[PDB]
Tab-separated table of N, CA and C (backbone and C1' of nucleotides) and ligand atoms in Angstrom:
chain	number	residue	atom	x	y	z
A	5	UNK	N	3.732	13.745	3.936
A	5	UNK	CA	2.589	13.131	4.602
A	5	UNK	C	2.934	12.787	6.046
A	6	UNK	N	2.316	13.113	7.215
A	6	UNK	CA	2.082	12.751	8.303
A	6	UNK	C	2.662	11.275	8.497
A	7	UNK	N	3.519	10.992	9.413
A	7	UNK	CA	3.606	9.710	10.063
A	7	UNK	C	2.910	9.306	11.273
A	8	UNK	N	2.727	8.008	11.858
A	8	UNK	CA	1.703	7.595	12.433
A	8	UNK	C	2.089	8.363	14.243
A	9	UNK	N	3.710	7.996	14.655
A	9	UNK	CA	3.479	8.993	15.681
A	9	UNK	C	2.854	10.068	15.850
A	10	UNK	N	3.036	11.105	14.947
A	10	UNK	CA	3.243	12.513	14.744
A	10	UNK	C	1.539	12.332	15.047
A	11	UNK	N	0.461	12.275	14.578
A	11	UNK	CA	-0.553	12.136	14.322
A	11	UNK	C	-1.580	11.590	15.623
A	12	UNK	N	-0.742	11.080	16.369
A	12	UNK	CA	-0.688	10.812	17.707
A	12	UNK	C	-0.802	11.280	18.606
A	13	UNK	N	0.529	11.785	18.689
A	13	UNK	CA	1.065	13.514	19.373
A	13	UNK	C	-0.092	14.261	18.931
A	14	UNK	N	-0.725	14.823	17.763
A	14	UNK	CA	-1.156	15.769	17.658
A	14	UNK	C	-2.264	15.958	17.917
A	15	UNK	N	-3.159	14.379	17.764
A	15	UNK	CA	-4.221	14.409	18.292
A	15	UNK	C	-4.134	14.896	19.945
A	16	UNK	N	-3.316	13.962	20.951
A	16	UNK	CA	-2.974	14.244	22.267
A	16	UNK	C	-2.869	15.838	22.486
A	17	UNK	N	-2.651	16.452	21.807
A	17	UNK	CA	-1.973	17.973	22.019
A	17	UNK	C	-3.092	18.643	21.887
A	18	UNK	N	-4.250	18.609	20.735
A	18	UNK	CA	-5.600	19.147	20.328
A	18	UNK	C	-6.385	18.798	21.183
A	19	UNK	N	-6.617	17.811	21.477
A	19	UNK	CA	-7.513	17.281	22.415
A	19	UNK	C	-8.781	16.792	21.892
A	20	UNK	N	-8.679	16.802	20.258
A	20	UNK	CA	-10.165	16.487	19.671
A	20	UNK	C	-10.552	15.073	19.744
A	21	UNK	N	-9.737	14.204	20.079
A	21	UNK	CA	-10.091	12.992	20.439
A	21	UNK	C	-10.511	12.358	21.509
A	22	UNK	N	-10.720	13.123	22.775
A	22	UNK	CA	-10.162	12.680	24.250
A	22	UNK	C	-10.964	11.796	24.783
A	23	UNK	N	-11.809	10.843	23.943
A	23	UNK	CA	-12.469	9.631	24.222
A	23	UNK	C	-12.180	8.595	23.472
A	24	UNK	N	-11.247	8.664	22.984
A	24	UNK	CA	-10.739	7.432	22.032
A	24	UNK	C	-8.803	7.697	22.441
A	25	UNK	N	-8.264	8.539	22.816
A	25	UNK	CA	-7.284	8.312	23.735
A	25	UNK	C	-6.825	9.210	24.516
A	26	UNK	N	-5.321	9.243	25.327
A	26	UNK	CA	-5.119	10.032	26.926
A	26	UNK	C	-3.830	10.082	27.281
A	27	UNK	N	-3.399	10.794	27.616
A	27	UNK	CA	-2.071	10.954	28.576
A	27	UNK	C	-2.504	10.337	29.497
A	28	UNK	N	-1.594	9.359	29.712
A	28	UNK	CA	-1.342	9.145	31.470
A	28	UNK	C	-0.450	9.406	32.218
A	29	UNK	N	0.827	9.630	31.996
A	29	UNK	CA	1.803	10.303	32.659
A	29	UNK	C	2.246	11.284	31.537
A	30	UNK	N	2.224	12.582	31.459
A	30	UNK	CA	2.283	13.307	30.793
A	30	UNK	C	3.799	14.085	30.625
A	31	UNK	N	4.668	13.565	32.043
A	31	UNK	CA	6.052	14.084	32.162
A	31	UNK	C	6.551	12.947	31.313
A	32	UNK	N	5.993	11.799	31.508
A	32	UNK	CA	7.236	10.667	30.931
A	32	UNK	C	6.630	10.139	29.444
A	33	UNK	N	5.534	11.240	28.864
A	33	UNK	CA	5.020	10.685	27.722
A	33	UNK	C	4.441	9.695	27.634
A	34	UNK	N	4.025	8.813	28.525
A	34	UNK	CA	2.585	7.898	28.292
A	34	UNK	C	1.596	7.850	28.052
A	35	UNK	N	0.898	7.452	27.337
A	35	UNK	CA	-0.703	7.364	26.457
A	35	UNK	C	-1.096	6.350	26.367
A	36	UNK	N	-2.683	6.385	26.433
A	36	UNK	CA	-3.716	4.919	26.672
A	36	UNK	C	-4.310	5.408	25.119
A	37	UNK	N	-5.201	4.093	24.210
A	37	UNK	CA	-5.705	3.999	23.890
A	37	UNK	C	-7.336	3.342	24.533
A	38	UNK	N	-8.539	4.131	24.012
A	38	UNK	CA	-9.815	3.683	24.637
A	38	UNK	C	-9.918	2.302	24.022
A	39	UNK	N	-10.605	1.443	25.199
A	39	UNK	CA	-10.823	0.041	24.620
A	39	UNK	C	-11.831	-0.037	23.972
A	40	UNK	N	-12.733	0.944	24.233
A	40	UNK	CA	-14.311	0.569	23.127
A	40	UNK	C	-14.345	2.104	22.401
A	41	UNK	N	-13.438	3.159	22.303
A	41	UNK	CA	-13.667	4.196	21.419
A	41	UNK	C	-12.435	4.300	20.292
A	42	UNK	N	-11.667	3.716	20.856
A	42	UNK	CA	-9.993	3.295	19.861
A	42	UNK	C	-10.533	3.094	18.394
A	43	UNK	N	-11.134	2.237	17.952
A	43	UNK	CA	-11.699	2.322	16.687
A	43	UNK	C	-12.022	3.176	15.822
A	44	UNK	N	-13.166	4.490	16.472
A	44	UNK	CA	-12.826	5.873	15.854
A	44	UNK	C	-11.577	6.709	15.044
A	45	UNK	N	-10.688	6.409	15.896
A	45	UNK	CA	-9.429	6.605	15.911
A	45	UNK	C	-8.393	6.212	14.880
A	46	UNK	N	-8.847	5.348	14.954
A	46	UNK	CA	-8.390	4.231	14.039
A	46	UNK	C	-9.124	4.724	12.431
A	47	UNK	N	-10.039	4.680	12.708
A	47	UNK	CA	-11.027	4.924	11.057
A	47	UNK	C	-10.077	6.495	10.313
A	48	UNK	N	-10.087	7.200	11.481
A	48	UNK	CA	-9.413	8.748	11.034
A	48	UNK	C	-8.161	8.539	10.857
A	49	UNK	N	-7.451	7.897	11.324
A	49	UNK	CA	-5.634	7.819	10.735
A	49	UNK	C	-5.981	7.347	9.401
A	50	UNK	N	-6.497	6.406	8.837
A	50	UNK	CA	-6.771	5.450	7.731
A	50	UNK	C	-7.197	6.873	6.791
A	51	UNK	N	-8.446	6.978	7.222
A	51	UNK	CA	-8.661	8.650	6.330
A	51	UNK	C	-8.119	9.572	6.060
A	52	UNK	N	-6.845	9.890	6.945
A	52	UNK	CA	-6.334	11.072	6.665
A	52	UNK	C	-5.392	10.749	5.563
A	53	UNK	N	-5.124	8.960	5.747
A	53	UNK	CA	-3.901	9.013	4.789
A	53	UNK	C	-4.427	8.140	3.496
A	54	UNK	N	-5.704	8.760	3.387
A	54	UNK	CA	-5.802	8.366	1.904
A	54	UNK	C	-6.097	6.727	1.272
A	55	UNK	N	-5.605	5.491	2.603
A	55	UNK	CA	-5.785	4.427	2.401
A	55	UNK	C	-6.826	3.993	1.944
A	56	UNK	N	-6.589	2.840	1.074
A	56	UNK	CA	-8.001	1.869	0.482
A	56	UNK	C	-8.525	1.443	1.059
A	57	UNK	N	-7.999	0.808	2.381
A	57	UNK	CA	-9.291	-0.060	3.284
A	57	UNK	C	-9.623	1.273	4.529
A	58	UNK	N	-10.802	0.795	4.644
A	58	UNK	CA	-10.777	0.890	6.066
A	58	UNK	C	-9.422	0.495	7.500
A	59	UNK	N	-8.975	1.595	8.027
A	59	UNK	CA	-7.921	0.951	8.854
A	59	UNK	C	-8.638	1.115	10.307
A	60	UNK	N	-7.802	-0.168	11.448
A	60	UNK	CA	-8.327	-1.082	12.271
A	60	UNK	C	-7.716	-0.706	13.324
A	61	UNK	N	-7.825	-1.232	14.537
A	61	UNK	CA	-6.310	-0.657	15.480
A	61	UNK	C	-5.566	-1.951	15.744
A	62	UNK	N	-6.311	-2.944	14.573
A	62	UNK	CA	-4.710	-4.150	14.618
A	62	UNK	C	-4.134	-3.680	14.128
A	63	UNK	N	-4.377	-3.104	12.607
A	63	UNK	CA	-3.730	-2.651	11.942
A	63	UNK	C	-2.532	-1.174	12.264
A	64	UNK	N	-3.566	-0.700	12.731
A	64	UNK	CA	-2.535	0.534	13.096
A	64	UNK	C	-1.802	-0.112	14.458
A	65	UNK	N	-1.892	-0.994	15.407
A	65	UNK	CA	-1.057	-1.408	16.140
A	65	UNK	C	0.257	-1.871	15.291
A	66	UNK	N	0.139	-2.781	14.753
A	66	UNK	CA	1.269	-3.482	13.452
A	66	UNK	C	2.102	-2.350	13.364
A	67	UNK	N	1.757	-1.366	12.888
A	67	UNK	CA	2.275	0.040	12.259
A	67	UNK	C	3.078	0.878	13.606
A	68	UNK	N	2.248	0.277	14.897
A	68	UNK	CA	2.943	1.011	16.070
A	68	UNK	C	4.269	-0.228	16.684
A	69	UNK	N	3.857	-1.115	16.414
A	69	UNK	CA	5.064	-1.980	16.790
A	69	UNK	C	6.581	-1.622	15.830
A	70	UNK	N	6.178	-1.383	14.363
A	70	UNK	CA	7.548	-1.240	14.291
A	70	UNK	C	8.278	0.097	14.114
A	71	UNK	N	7.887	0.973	15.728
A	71	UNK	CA	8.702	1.871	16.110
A	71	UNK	C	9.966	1.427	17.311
A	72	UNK	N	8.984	0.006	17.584
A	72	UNK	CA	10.028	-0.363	18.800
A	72	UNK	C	11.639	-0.308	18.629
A	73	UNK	N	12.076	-0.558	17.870
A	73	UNK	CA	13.456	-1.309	17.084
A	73	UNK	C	13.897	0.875	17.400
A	74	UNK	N	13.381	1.173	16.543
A	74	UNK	CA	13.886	2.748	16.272
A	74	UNK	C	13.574	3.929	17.597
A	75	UNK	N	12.254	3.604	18.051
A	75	UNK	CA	12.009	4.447	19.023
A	75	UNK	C	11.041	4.986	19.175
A	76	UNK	N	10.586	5.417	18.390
A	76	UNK	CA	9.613	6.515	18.680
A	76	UNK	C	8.789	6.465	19.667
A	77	UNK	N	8.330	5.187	19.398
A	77	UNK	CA	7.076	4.789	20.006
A	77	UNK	C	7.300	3.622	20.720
A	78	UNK	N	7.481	3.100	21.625
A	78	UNK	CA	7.696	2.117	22.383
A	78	UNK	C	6.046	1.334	23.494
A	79	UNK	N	5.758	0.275	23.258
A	79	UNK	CA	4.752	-0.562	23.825
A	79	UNK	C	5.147	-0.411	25.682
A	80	UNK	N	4.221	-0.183	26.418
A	80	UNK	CA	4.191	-0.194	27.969
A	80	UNK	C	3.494	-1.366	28.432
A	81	UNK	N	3.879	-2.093	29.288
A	81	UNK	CA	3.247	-3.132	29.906
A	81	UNK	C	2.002	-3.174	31.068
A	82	UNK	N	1.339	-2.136	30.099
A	82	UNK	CA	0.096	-1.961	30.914
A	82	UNK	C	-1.053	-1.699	29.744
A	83	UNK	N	-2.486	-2.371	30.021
A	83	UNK	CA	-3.625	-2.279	28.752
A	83	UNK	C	-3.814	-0.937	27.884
A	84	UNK	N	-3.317	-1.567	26.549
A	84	UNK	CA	-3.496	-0.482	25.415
A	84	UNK	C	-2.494	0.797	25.687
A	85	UNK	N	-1.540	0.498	26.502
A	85	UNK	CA	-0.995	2.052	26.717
A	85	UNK	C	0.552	2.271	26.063
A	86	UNK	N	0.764	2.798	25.887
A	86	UNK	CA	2.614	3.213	24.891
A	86	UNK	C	3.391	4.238	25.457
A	87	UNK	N	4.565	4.586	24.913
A	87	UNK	CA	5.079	6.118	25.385
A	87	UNK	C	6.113	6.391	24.062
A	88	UNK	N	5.641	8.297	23.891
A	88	UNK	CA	6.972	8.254	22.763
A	88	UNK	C	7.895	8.813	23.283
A	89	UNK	N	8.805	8.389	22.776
A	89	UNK	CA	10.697	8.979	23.182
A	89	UNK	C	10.636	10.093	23.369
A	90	UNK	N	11.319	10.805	24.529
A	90	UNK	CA	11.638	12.363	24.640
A	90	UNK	C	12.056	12.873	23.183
A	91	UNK	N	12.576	12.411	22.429
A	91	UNK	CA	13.233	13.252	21.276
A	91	UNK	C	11.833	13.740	20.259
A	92	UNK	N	10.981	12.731	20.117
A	92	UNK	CA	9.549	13.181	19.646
A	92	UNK	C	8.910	14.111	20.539
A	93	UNK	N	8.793	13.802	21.703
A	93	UNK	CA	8.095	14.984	22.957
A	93	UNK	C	8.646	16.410	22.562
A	94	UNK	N	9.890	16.689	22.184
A	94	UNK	CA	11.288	17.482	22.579
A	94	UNK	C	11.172	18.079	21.100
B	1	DA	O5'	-15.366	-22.894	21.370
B	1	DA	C5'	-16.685	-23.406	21.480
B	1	DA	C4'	-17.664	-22.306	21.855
B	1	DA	C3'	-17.493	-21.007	21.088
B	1	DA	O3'	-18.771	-20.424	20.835
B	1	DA	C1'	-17.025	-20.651	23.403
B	2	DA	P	-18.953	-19.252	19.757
B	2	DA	O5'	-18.592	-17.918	20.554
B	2	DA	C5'	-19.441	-17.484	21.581
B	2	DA	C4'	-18.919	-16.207	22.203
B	2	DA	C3'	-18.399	-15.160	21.213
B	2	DA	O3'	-18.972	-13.881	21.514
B	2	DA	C1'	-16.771	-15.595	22.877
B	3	DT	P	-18.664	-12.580	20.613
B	3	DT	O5'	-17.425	-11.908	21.367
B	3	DT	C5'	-17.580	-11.486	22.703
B	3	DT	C4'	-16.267	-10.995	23.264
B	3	DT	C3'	-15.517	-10.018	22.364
B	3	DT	O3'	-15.545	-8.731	22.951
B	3	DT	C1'	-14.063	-11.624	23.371
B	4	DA	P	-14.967	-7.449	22.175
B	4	DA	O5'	-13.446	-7.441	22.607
B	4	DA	C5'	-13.134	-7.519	23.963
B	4	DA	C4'	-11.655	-7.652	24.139
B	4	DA	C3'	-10.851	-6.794	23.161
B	4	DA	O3'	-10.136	-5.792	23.904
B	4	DA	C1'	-9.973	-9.030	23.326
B	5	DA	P	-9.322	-4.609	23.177
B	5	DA	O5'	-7.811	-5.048	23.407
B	5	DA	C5'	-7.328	-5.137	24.735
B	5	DA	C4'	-6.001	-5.867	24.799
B	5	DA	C3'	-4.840	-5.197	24.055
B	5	DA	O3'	-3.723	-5.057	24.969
B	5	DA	C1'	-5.034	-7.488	23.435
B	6	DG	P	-2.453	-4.147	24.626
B	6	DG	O5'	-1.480	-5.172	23.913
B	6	DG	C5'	-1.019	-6.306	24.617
B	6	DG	C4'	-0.308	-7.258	23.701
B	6	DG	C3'	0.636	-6.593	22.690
B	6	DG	O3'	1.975	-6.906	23.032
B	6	DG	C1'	-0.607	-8.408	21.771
B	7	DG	P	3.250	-6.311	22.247
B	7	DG	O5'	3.445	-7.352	21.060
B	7	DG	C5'	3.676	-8.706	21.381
B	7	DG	C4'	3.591	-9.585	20.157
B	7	DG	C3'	4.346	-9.076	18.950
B	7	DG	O3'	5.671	-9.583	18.992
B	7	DG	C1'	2.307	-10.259	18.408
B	8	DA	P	6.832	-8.972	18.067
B	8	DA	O5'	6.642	-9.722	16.667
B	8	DA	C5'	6.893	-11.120	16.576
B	8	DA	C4'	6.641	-11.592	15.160
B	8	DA	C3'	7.302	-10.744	14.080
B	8	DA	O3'	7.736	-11.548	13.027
B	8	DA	C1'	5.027	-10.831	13.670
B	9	DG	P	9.274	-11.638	12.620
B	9	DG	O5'	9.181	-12.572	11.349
B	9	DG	C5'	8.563	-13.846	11.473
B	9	DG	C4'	7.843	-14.224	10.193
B	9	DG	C3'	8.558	-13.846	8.905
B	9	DG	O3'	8.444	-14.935	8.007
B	9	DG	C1'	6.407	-12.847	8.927
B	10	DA	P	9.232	-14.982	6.612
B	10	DA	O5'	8.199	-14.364	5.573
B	10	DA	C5'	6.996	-15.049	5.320
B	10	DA	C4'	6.074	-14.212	4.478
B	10	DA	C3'	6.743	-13.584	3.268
B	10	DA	O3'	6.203	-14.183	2.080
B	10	DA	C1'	5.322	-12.032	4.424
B	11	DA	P	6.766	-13.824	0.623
B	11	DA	O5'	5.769	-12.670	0.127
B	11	DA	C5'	4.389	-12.967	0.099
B	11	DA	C4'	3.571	-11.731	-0.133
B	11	DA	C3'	4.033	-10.847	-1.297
B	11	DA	O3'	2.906	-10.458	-2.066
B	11	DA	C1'	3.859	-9.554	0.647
B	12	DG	P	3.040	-9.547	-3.391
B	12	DG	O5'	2.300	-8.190	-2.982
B	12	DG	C5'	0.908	-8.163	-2.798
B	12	DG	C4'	0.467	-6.758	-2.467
B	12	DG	C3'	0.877	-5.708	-3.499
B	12	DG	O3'	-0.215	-4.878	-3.785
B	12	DG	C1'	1.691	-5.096	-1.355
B	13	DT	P	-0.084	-3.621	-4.785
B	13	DT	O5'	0.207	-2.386	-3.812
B	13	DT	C5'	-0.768	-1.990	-2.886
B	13	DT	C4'	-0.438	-0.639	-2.313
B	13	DT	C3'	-0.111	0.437	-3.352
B	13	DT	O3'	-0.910	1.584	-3.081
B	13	DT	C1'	1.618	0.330	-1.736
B	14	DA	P	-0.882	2.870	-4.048
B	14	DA	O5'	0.200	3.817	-3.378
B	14	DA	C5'	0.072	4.197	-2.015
B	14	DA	C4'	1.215	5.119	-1.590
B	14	DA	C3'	1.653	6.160	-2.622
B	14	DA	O3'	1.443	7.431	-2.052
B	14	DA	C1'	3.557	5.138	-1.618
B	15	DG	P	1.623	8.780	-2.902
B	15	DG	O5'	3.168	9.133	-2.740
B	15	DG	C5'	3.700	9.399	-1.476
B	15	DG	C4'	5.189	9.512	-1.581
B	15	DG	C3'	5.679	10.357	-2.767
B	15	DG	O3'	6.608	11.353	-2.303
B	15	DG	C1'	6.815	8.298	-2.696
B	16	DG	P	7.021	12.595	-3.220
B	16	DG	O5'	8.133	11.992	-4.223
B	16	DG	C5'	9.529	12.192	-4.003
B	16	DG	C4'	10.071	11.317	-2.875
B	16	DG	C3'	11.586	11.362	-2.712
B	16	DG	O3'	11.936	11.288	-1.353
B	16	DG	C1'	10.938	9.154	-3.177
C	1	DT	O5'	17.048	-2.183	-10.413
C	1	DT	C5'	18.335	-1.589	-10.618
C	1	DT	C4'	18.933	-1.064	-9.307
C	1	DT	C3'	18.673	-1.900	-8.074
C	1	DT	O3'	19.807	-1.812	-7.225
C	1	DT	C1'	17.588	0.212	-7.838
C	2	DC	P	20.018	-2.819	-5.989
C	2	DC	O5'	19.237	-2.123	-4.799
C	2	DC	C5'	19.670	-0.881	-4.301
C	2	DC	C4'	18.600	-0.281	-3.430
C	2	DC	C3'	17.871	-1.284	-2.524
C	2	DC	O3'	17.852	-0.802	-1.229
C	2	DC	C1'	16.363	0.080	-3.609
C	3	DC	P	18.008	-1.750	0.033
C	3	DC	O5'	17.529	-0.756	1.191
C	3	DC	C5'	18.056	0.585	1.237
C	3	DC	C4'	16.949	1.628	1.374
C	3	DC	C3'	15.959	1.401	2.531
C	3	DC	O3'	16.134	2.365	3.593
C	3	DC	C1'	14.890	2.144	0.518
C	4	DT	P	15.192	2.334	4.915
C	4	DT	O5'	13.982	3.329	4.577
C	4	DT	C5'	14.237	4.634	4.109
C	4	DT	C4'	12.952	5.445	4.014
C	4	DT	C3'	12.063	5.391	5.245
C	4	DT	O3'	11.541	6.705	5.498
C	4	DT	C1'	10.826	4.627	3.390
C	5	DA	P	11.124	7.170	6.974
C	5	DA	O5'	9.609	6.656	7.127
C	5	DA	C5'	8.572	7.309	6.432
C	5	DA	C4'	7.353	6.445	6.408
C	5	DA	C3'	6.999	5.843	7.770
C	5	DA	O3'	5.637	6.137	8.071
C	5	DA	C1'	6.954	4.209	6.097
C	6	DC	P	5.050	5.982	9.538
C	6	DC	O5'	4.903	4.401	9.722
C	6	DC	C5'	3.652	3.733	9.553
C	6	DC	C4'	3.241	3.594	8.102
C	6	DC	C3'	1.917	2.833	7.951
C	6	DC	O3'	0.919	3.635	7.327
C	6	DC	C1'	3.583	1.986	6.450
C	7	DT	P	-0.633	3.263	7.511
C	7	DT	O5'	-0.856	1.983	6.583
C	7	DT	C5'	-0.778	2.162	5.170
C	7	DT	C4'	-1.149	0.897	4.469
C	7	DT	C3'	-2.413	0.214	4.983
C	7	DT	O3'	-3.236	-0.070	3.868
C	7	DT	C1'	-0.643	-1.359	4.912
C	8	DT	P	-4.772	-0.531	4.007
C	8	DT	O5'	-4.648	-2.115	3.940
C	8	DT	C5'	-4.227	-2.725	2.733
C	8	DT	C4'	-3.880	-4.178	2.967
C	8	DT	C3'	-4.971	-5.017	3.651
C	8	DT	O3'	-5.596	-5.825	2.667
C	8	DT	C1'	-2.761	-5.607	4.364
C	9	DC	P	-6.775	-6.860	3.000
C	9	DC	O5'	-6.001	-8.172	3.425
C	9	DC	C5'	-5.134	-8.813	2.502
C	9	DC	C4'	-4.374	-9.919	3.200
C	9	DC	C3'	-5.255	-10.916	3.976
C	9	DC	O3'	-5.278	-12.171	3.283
C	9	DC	C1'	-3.251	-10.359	5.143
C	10	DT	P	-6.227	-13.401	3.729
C	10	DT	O5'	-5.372	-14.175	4.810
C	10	DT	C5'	-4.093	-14.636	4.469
C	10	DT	C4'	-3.356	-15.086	5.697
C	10	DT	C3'	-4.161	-15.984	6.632
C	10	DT	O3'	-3.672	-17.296	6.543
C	10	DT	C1'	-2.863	-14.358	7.814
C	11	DC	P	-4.472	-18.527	7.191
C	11	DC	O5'	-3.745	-18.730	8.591
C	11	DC	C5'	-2.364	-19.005	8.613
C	11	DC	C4'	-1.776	-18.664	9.961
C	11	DC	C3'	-2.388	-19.418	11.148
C	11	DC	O3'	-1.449	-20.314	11.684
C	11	DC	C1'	-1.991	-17.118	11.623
C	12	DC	P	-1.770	-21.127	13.032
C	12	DC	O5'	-1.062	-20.270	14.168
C	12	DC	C5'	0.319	-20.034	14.097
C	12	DC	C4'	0.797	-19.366	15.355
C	12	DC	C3'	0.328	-20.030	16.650
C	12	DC	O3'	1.406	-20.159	17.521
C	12	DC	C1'	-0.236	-17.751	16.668
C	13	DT	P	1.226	-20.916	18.924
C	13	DT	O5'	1.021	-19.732	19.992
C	13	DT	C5'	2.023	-18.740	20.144
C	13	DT	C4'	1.681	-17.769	21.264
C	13	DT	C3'	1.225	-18.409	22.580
C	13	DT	O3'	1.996	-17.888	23.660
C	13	DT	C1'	-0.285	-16.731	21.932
C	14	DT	P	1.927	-18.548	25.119
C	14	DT	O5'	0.960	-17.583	25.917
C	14	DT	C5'	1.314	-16.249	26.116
C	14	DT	C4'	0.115	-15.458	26.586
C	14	DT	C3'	-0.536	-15.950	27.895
C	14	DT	O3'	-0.357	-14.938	28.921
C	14	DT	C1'	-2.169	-15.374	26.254
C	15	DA	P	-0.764	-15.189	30.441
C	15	DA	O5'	-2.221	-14.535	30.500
C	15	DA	C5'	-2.382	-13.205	30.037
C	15	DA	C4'	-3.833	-12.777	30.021
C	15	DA	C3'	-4.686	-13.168	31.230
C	15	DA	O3'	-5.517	-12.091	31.566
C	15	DA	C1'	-5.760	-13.807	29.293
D	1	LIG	NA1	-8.353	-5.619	19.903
DNA sequence: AATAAGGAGAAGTAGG
DNA sequence: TCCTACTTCTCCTTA
């Protein structure tokens, strides 16, 4: 089953989302989440993986925080935006 | 107040 | 047994 980076990436790569999120620096792997379309987004990770509730983007935030420690996914100090590790890019 | 992003400890679920 | 990789719930902080 898909993990929550990966799913990320792949949306970013397809482009079927591109109003609910974005590259912003695309060399150094940075991505925004939309502040009023993020939710969409959110509903489809939850769906793909089969979950009982409805999932949220607190929820899937929760789920993005604990990449910090490991990597993948690391929080940017700018609104709604992240970056994943070259080794995921790579 | 209302809204929103960011946060995390604790306990539950999935599939090894 | 006991960890993975989240999910769900609840409450706190800052803007
Ligand atoms: Na929010």
């Amino acid at each position: 089953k898909i993990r929550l980076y990966q799913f990320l990436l792949d949306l970013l790569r397809s482009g079927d989302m591109k109003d609910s999120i974005w590259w912003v620096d695309k060399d150094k792997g940075t991505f925004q989440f939309s502040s009023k379309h993020k939710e969409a987004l959110a509903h489809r990770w939850g769906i793909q993986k089969g979950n009982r509730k409805k999932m949220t983007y607190q929820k899937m935030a929760r789920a993005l925080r604990n990449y910090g420690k490991t990597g993948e996914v690391k929080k940017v100090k700018k609104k709604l935006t992240y970056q994943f590790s070259g080794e995921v890019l790579g």
